Amino acid sequence: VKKYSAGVKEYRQTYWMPEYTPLDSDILACFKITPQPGVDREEAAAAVAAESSTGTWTTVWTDLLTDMDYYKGRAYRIEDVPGDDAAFYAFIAYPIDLFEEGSVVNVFTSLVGNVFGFKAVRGLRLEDVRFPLAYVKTCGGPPHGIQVERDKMNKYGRPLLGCTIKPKLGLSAKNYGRAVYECLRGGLDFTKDDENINSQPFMRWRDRFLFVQDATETAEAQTGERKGHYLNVTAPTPEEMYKRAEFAKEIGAPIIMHDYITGGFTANTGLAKWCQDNGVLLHIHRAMHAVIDRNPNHGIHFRVLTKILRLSGGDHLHTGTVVGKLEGDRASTLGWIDLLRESFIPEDRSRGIFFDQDWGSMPGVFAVASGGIHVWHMPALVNIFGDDSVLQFGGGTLGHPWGNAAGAAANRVALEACVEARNQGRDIEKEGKEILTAAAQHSPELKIAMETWKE
């Protein structure tokens, strides 16, 4: 358009470009639109493209001051949703110039800011986002990544083992350290603060960090293996968050943890840069993901949140446990684990991967499994996740009949037996019981652990 004509106009006239070929620099988004009957697909797609980028509900003269053809987001492909005729996939291209470089915040705000509120759609689901390599290079990414972390902690050949201290709340700092000490001395690589553990009247953070570090060092001396505890630095303000991170560095804590959604992307990105500058590993908890990621018709798929975390920065990311998930959602889970860890993920619709995602040199992130998992889950966990994973057994350790040290040893024996059997070429999931039963003959801890919880 070259002349200014005021009034309301249809989004399709400008934001639906079926013949557009996305550039390599473009950010691409796949939205699953469940529109209200009566609204046209192209118009729904164009409306999402316009409102997420440069469009307005009515024509504004200021558009003529700039070149909307260059800047505008454009819907370029419509596809059916397999097996769901109420919904369709809209593919929208966004010029890279629309986004602040190195800002997952800005890109996220633009894509999810207000399109989710449209009365035209019954539901809007952001399925996938193609971050071009040019954008990826502007982002800090994981402060260390899988390989650097293994070198720093001198851990090779197996998944790492972790435990969340339980109960989630209520323990004093000294008792918290006692629980940490017992878990670590028994064979866990890591222990962690619960996501809810920040600084509470029952346990102030500085007291917690001191006792935990004492526990970590004592266990490390007594086992001859490196140990860590993810100290939660999630805090009310950035100043408080950095203060806690600095104290962890000062006392020699190798790893800290943060809640990137609840704490927020701005805080997380700053923390990730701080972690890289100070050599501290960063474990990321995904609290609130289920609020946003569960509903298949409305929200954001976790795979998108996974990509944002890798760009924002974390050395570990909580990924849930595939054991609970059904086979339909298993392939999707394997999909985002590849996104978390691999360098190049090719497009694969069966796994929910709508775009080729190139990470280039950006390091991979440890996948973290947790939940109500215990020794019996070990074979399936080792199979699904592989070596570059952290398996966290909170209840499965502190709930052992003989205490944390025995529970840790039971999990450690189960893990090592599964790994040894895998390396020998056995099908660990098929032979899981036999493997665990054989290992239990040499470990009373594993034996009673297998009796405590059911297969």
Interface of this chain with other proteins, residues 97 to 116, rule: CB under 8 A: none
Question: Considering only CA atoms, which of 394, 30, 343, 18 is closest in space to residue 230?
Answer: 394
Burial class (CB in 10 A: 0-12, 13-18, 19+), 374: buried
What residues numbered 340-369 form the site for other proteins, per CB under 8 A? 341-345, 356, 358, 360-361, 363-364
Determine, following the binding rule CB under 8 A, whether residue 419 of this chain makes contact with a copy of itself: no
Does the annotation list 195 as a binding residue?
yes
Phi then psi for 100, rounded to 5 degrees?
-65, 130
Whether 243 is catalytic:
no
User: Which helix (DSSP H) or strand (DSSP E) does residue 103 occupy?
Assistant: none
- Which is closer to other proteins, CB of 238 or CB of 403? 403
Determine, following the binding rule CB under 8 A, whether residue 323 of this chain makes contact with a copy of itself: no
Mapping DSSP to helix (H, G, I), strand (E, B) and coil, where does residue 314 land? coil
What residues numbered 159-188 form the site for a copy of itself, per CB under 8 A? 165-175, 178-179
Catalytic residue among 152, 155, 166, 243: 166
* Near a copy of itself by CB under 8 A: residue from 218, 223, 262, 383: 262
Does the annotation list 51 as a binding residue?
no
Catalytic residue among 285, 301, 377, 447: 285
Does the annotation list 318 as a binding residue?
yes
What residues numbered 392-411 form the site for other proteins, per CB under 8 A? 401-406, 408-409
**Tokens, residue 297:** 């018709």
| Residue whose pair of structure tokens reads 């969340």 in the numeric block | 164
Does the annotation list 258 as a binding residue?
no
**Cβ proximity of 4 and 61 under 8 Å:** yes
- Residue 41, binding choice from a copy of itself, other proteins, none, Cβ under 5 to 8 Å by partner class: none
Determine, following the binding rule CB under 8 A, whether residue 57 of this chain makes contact with other proteins: no
**Strand-by-strand arrangement of the 281-285 sheet:** 160-162, 389-392, 366-369, 316-318, 281-285, 255-259, 228-232, 190-192
CB under 8 Å to 109, separation ≥6 — which residues? none
Whether 316 is catalytic:
no
What residues numbered 70-99 form the site for other proteins, per CB under 8 A? 70, 95
Site string for a copy of itself, 233-252 (x = CB under 8 A): -xxxxxx-xx----------
* Near a copy of itself by CB under 8 A: residue from 198, 213, 389, 443: 198
Size of the site for other proteins (CB under 8 A): 78
- Which is closer to a copy of itself, CB of 314 or CB of 421? 314
- Which is closer to a copy of itself, CB of 377 or CB of 422? 377
What residues numbered 369-398 form the site for a copy of itself, per CB under 8 A? 371-372, 374, 394-396, 398
What residues numbered 189-208 form the site for other proteins, per CB under 8 A? 202
**Cβ proximity of 143 and 275 under 8 Å:** yes
Question: Considering only CA atoms, which of 242, 250, 182, 237 is closest in space to residue 210?
Answer: 250
* Near a copy of itself by CB under 8 A: residue from 36, 196, 222, 423: 196
For residues 24 and 169, give the distance between their C-alpha atoms in angstroms, rounded to a whole number. Answer: 48
**Tokens, residue 303:** 């795979």
- Which is closer to a copy of itself, CB of 372 or CB of 386? 372
Q: Measuring CA to CA, how many Å separate 50 from each of 111, 157, 336, 428?
A: 11, 50, 28, 51
Torsion of CA 355, 262, 213, 184, to 10 degrees: -60
Does the annotation list 152 as a binding residue?
no
Positions marked catalytic: 166, 285
